[PDB]
Design an enzyme around this catalytic site. Structure first.
Site, mmCIF file in Angstrom:
data_model
loop_
_atom_site.group_PDB
_atom_site.id
_atom_site.type_symbol
_atom_site.label_atom_id
_atom_site.label_comp_id
_atom_site.label_asym_id
_atom_site.label_seq_id
_atom_site.Cartn_x
_atom_site.Cartn_y
_atom_site.Cartn_z
ATOM 1 N N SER A 48 40.012 17.132 61.559
ATOM 2 C CA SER A 48 40.973 17.752 60.657
ATOM 3 C C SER A 48 42.345 17.073 60.749
ATOM 4 O O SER A 48 43.398 17.723 60.890
ATOM 5 C CB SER A 48 41.048 19.247 60.936
ATOM 6 N N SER A 58 43.019 23.231 55.763
ATOM 7 C CA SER A 58 42.183 22.031 55.909
ATOM 8 C C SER A 58 40.845 22.098 55.207
ATOM 9 O O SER A 58 40.160 21.069 55.154
ATOM 10 C CB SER A 58 42.003 21.627 57.371
ATOM 11 N N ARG A 99 36.786 32.781 63.852
ATOM 12 C CA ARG A 99 36.513 32.242 62.536
ATOM 13 C C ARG A 99 35.118 31.610 62.488
ATOM 14 O O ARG A 99 34.519 31.509 61.412
ATOM 15 C CB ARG A 99 37.690 31.310 62.221
ATOM 16 N N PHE A 136 42.790 26.325 58.984
ATOM 17 C CA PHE A 136 43.739 27.194 59.688
ATOM 18 C C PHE A 136 45.137 26.885 59.162
ATOM 19 O O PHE A 136 45.609 25.749 59.281
ATOM 20 C CB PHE A 136 43.639 26.932 61.194
ATOM 21 N N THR A 153 36.244 23.764 58.821
ATOM 22 C CA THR A 153 37.193 24.791 59.227
ATOM 23 C C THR A 153 38.525 24.627 58.517
ATOM 24 O O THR A 153 38.891 23.554 58.049
ATOM 25 C CB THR A 153 37.457 24.680 60.724
HETATM 26 B B1 LIG Z 1 43.725 22.393 59.081
HETATM 27 O O1 LIG Z 1 43.822 23.731 58.519
HETATM 28 O O2 LIG Z 1 42.621 22.416 59.990
HETATM 29 C C1 LIG Z 1 42.943 22.664 61.387
HETATM 30 C C2 LIG Z 1 42.196 23.570 62.146
HETATM 31 C C3 LIG Z 1 41.044 24.274 61.481
HETATM 32 O O3 LIG Z 1 40.458 23.644 60.579
HETATM 33 O O4 LIG Z 1 40.681 25.442 61.796
HETATM 34 C C4 LIG Z 1 42.516 23.786 63.488
HETATM 35 C C5 LIG Z 1 43.615 23.090 64.043
HETATM 36 C C6 LIG Z 1 44.371 22.189 63.269
HETATM 37 C C7 LIG Z 1 44.037 21.965 61.927
HETATM 38 C C8 LIG Z 1 44.822 21.013 60.991
HETATM 39 C C9 LIG Z 1 45.102 21.789 59.734
HETATM 40 N N1 LIG Z 1 45.956 22.897 60.135
HETATM 41 C C10 LIG Z 1 47.372 22.680 60.344
HETATM 42 O O5 LIG Z 1 47.857 21.569 60.145
HETATM 43 C C11 LIG Z 1 48.212 23.913 60.789
HETATM 44 C C12 LIG Z 1 47.941 24.211 62.265
HETATM 45 C C13 LIG Z 1 48.772 25.385 62.772
HETATM 46 C C14 LIG Z 1 50.239 25.244 62.437
HETATM 47 C C15 LIG Z 1 50.498 24.883 60.995
HETATM 48 C C16 LIG Z 1 49.694 23.679 60.536
#
Ligand SMILES: *[B@@]1([O])OC2=C(C([O])=O)[C]=[C][C]=C2[C][C]1[N]C(=O)[C]1[C][C][C][C][C]1
Ligand SMILES: *[B@@]1([O])OC2=C(C([O])=O)[C]=[C][C]=C2[C][C]1[N]C(=O)[C]1[C][C][C][C][C]1
Ligand SMILES: [Cl-]
Ligand code: NA
EC number: 3.5.2.6
Lengths: 246, 247
Positions: B97, B49, B232, B190, B188
């Site tokens: 996100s 993200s 993080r 993930f 952020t």
């Molecule tokens: B994205 O990376 O941002 C995000 C975050 C973050 O920014 O730390 C936290 C929770 C959800 C998201 C949405 C995006 N990440 C995903 O879509 C991802 C979540 C875990 C499983 C695979 C897809």
């Protein structure tokens, strides 16, 4: 600006503190505003430091403020507030309300261009008499709460007669609270404690973005003692909380 | 980017938590950066993200995103997080996100214009293979912490190859803390938990404006359990506190 309706129930937050003032609150999606005092909502007052909003835009438009990352250096000579005795960014100078920074901006803008932009912006009575570096603090410039809301709505929409870039720069400089689905842009003003029979004015103006809604607001009150200055935020905050905005 | 020096003393904040990761911190006035792990600082990972930053700029540049105040309406079909199941502004969709909003933006941008802008932005390995709506989450796109800092420094200065207006729009959407003499922009990321021996990645990138100083940062870490995700932010925050920045 949409229609405006008087709601005298908001006077409760004012009488509790014995404050003579006005709050104007507009909800963008419904093109509708409410106020505790229709007459005062249209009454014009010195803008004081709320004038930092147009002055910053005008400084950028004219090139006096070179770009969004201009630093305003302190010459090391005494300034009236310790918070001003340091180098400042544009956002910092706005947030700490650094009068001398904006006085020099105004001098460099000069009277011709200043008059020109206040016309373009429909900013109050557009009267810049009283000295180029002080007309908004102790001169003849006056603006109403209604007009402040109108000006801010235009700024939000990037519709002032200035570049979109310079409007966006000043918008970020006005952010005062940031959360994932809640963002506040605001600016305080305070003219002083006035004189016998002639109180000063204190202002809080801005807007709240909550989810996909936008709420524009302008507050002013008579003030003759600095100890009352926290009311300029607490009364509008309590009203906005009662409306569920927060 | 300025010079970069390895500071292995920061490793205490990682080893205390058994985290494999990197932090890069650059101070603008001195044109100098520090990192706990120079090699990892240049190693490229899925942006996840954090890609919402370029994607938002590109969406505006191409007109897919109509203007600063476009609302992304929710069609009422289930989304992966309840926090996404609502109409969103551009800032809202970034801050929570909201993956499906940006997948649709990417599809409308399309592969050709996306490729062009990632070349303009010098964005990592610029590899968008793996599906136009998935390359930054599960495809081949990779970017290092150093490259994130370079990209953010350009964005801060309005020097990306995009309009100044669109850079400013995305900057305000990234504000996450605001005080009179302290302002934070951050995002952020993930990617997921991966597997044992092929862990996911978690990111925190942004910058801090404190008085007239500016500090750019990028953090990433390997992650194989969602319960570790708060590190993080906590590891970079503790480093920045130790530096007197606070974060
Ligand atoms: B994205 O990376 O941002 C995000 C975050 C973050 O920014 O730390 C936290 C929770 C959800 C998201 C949405 C995006 N990440 C995903 O879509 C991802 C979540 C875990 C499983 C695979 C897809
Ligand atoms: B300005 O109006 O903003 C301001 C504030 C505020 O807005 O609440 C508080 C303290 C200082 C300032 C600077 C500007 N006000 C003045 O210059 C005013 C200060 C008190 C004496 C009369 C002049
Ligand atoms: Cl002074
Ligand atoms: Na640098």
């Amino acid at each position: 600006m949409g229609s405006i309706t008087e709601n005298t129930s908001w006077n409760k937050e004012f009488s509790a503190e014995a404050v003579n003032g006005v709050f104007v609150l507009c909800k963008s999606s419904s093109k509708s505003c409410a106020t505790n005092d229709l007459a005062r909502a249209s009454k014009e007052y010195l803008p004081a430091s709320t004038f930092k909003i147009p002055n910053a835009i005008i400084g950028l438009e004219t090139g006096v403020i070179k770009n969004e990352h201009q630093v305003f250096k302190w010459d090391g000579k005494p300034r009236a507030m310790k918070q001003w005795e340091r180098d400042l960014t544009l956002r910092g100078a706005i947030q700490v309300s650094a009068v001398p920074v904006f006085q020099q901006i105004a001098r460099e803008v000069g009277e011709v261009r200043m008059q020109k932009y206040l016309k373009k912006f429909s900013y109050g009575n557009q009267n810049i008499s009283g000295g180029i570096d002080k007309f908004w603090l102790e001169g003849q410039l006056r603006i109403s709460a209604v007009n402040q809301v109108e000006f801010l709505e235009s700024l939000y929409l990037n519709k002032l007669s200035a570049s979109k870039e310079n409007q966006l720069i000043v918008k970020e400089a006005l952010v005062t609270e940031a959360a994932p689905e809640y963002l506040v842009h605001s600016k305080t003003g305070f003219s002083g404690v006035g004189t016998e029979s002639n109180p000063g004015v204190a202002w809080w103006v801005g807007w709240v973005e909550k989810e996909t809604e936008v709420y524009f607001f302008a507050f002013n009150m008579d003030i003759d003692n600095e100890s009352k200055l926290p009311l300029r935020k607490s009364i509008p905050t309590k009203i906005m909380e009662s409306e569920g905005i927060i």
